Amino acid sequence: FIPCPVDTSQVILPPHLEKIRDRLAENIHELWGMNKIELGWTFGKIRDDNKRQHPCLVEFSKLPETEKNYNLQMSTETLKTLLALGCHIAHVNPAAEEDLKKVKLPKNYMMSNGYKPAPLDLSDVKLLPPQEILVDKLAENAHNVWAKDRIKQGWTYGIQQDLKNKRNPRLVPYALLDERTKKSNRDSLREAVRTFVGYGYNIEPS
Numbered sequence: 648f649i650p651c652p653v654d655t656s657q658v659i660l661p662p663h664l665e666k667i668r669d670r671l672a673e674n675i676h677e678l679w680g681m682n683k684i685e686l687g688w689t690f691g692k693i694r695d696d697n698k699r700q701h702p703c704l705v706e707f708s709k710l711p712e713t714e715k716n717y718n719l720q721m722s723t724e725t726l727k728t729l730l731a732l733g734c735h736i737a738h739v740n741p742a743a744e745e746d747l748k749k750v751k752l753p754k755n756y757m758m759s760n761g762y763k764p765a766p767l768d769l770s771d772v773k774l775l776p777p778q779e780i781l782v783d784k785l786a787e788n789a790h791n792v793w794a795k796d797r798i799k800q801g802w803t804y805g806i807q808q809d810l811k812n813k814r815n816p817r818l819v820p821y822a823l824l825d826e827r828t829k830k831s832n833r834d835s836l837r838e839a840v841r842t843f844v845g846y847g848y849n850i851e852p853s
């Protein structure tokens with residue numbers, strides 16, 4: 648397995664998309680905590696897999712920019728993958744950014760940091776069927792990209808994951824992956840294109 652992702656080598660992000668790139672990476676983390684908290688993770692000085700404790704389970708801006716600019720980066724490439732696939736993104740709708748409301752999580756989510764995630768309630772943002780085919784590409788590119796950095800880091804495939812060694816159970820082509828994760832991946836990137844709409848951006852090629 649060698650992942651061959653889309654060549655974003657020549658795409659350059661325009662400055663008017665800095666806000667939406669920033670404002671998207673802000674929500675990808677709020678979904679991250681929410682999902683971790685739903686699996687039982689808590690806050691800790693450093694990550695503890697045994698205790699299920701994470702240090703980066705803090706407000707987005709408070710993150711270490713080493714582990715924080717990975718959000719902006721992994722999201723910057725998520726916008727630069729759209730321009731490559733033929734789109735152009737334009738902020739056409741002014742009124743969207745005000746009706747935008749964030750989810751009210753139950754109070755048991757607030758932790759030692761007094762921090763409770765607030766994902767966007769993109770409940771009614773139902774993407775047009777053309778925008779669904781787009782997600783399946785991004786949902787697939789996200790795997791080939793994530794696996795591409797793995798092999799350069801040195802990683803290999805194992806029966807189950809060994810955190811110490813380079814062995815992982817999901818360094819396989821997209822065809823071998825499980826339906827649960829394939830949908831899990833596209834569940835997030837569906838919620839990402841929903842964010843461009845939630846702020847009023849048009850995902851239309853000319």
Ligand SMILES: Nc1ncnc2c1ncn2[C@@H]1O[C@H](COP(=O)(O)OP(=O)(O)OP(=O)(O)O)[C@@H](O)[C@H]1O
Binds near residue numbers: 686703808
């Ligand atoms: N350096 C890291 N920083 C933050 N999160 C990480 C890091 N490395 C791995 N993860 C998390 O690990 C997850 C992948 O783990 P995997 O899906 O194999 O098991 P899991 O879903 O964590 O299992 P469970 O949630 O039931 O314990 C990713 O969703 C990611 O959030």
